[PDB]
Amino acid sequence: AIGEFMVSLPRMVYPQPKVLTPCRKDVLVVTPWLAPIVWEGTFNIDILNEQFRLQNTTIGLTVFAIKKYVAFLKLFLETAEKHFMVGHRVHYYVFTDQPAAVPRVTLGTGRQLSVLEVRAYSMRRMEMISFCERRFLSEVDYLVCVDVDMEFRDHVGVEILTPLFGTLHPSFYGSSREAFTYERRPQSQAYIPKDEGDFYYMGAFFGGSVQEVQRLTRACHQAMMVDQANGIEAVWHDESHLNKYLLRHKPTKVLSPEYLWDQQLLGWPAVLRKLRFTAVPK
Amino acid sequence: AIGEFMVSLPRMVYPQPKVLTPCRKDVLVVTPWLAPIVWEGTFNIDILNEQFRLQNTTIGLTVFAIKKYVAFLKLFLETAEKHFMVGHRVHYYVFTDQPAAVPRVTLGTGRQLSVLEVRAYSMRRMEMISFCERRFLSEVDYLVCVDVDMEFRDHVGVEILTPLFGTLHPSFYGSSREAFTYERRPQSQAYIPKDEGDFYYMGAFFGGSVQEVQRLTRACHQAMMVDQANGIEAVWHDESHLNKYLLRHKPTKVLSPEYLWDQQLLGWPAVLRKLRFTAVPK
Ligand SMILES: O=c1ccn([C@@H]2O[C@H](COP(=O)(O)OP(=O)(O)O[C@H]3O[C@H](CO)[C@@H](O)[C@H](O)[C@H]3O)[C@@H](O)[C@H]2O)c(=O)[nH]1
Ligand SMILES: O=c1ccn([C@@H]2O[C@H](COP(=O)(O)OP(=O)(O)O[C@H]3O[C@H](CO)[C@@H](O)[C@H](O)[C@H]3O)[C@@H](O)[C@H]2O)c(=O)[nH]1
Ligand SMILES: [Mn+2]
Ligand SMILES: [Mn+2]
Fold first, then answer.
1. Any chain A CB within 8 A of the CB of B191?
2. Which of A170, A220, A164, A219 is nearest to A199 (CA)?
3. Which of A43, A263, A277, B131 has the most beta carbons within 10 angstroms of its beta carbon?
């Protein structure tokens, strides 16, 4: 459930947070609109697990595996079982043009997988997320929407959950805003001028409550349709639109690049204590 | 309104948040349950003002002025007009045994004051807040509950608003938990053992959404009634109970001691960039 009566936490023994000791001094851990930026060392997962289990939280995870990308499902799902929301209720929604190619993956208790068949034609995921509206409202509390050509290597848990989140793109977290690859043509709905922008968010990992995710995906789909009607395609497709949306609708948490990393491309810099969810070649 | 459809922010020009530059390196700016701790330098008030004005947010402020404490109202209210939620809708609720002693204070536009008469007997504020339940639900989005023997000296605005907040007590923000003056007798409902506790919150400044404030004040009133029936009075009265509640129900923001300070007692230490709401002698 979200927003419902919250019962008392039980007694817990854990280290006292100390006001005059910051968790992390090397990174920004809160945005200027007071949204946490989630890095290792900023959260006590035991407190968070208690809070979310007491609400019997169910997390939906959407993933698209169309054409050759069905090959990525086995590693994606098997590593999700090891690292994604373990202990919580999880419902995977696998959208594919080849239901028979979905691997048979053994799931832990309280976890389920639904195969949803779609047509084969990246930019139409927004539309499909916004066919499933009624399904998701009835079945899960939060939605997490990710790319499939990825693997989990470390904990990805309830610390991410919030009404609306985006993830810092691993190539741009140190960049100034004029360097961000936002859509820069005023003719596109995704247009952001050079003096605007907080962050460059990656289209590969966003989420939130079902209501907020439906609002985002609806808005991005509508904006993409407008661009299509006007004969323009944003430079980075759905990611350009996601960036425009999150500029105008500030996320209530921001995930650090721990949550979307490419080790082949970018190595393992000092600012990353954990590499949680990472690109697979292709 | 709270929780309703959020329209898009307009274009804004402001400094880019930089991921590899923390706002503040000298203090903890997020709790281990991912609640912001509100210090100067952590928020862009222009972004927050936009967000809350777009929801037409109304803030209720409750204050009790019983017996000799009516003398504190003039400075309290006049300085609130200068510094508290300026630009937003505000409704003051002044609870007093002497309605005629309430000073005639000139209010800015969009601000109103109601005088509520009560009986003269600190611990019964929880009960009165939890007589007013229907009134507050109909009239305001957030409630802020404060002591009267105080003055505003600097900005106190929408950066504080969240479902549930407490404020760090100015005498104890650097203390280890065993030193906190929690109720330590197991016979009291307010009991917290020496190995538990995040922070020591002051009873003089707490708040949240109307729903969460009613939950807190109801729970504290019920706990205080149990203690009374058992012949025990918590060491710091309502503040002991507030501390127990916020241990078991984590606040979604924590205000730094900028928001409750005593300059006569504690001076102006380096960690405080602003002194916003401060004790008046008596
Ligand atoms: O033939 C395809 C092509 C794409 N996909 C799905 O769409 C996702 C995105 O495509 P992918 O090739 O992974 O794109 P990338 O270049 O790795 O990622 C960029 O492009 C994506 C789509 O615009 C955004 O989500 C990312 O943020 C952006 O970095 C894939 O993971 C799949 O889930 C398929 O299922 N089949
Ligand atoms: O005769 C009185 C006594 C108290 N009050 C009200 O109750 C508040 C609390 O009393 P006060 O004397 O200000 O208590 P303090 O010792 O300054 O504050 C401590 O006691 C309060 C009451 O337990 C808590 O709110 C504070 O966190 C705690 O620091 C006052 O500000 C008034 O609003 C009156 O109106 N008339
Ligand atoms: Mn990819
Ligand atoms: Mn006082």
1. no
2. A170
3. A277
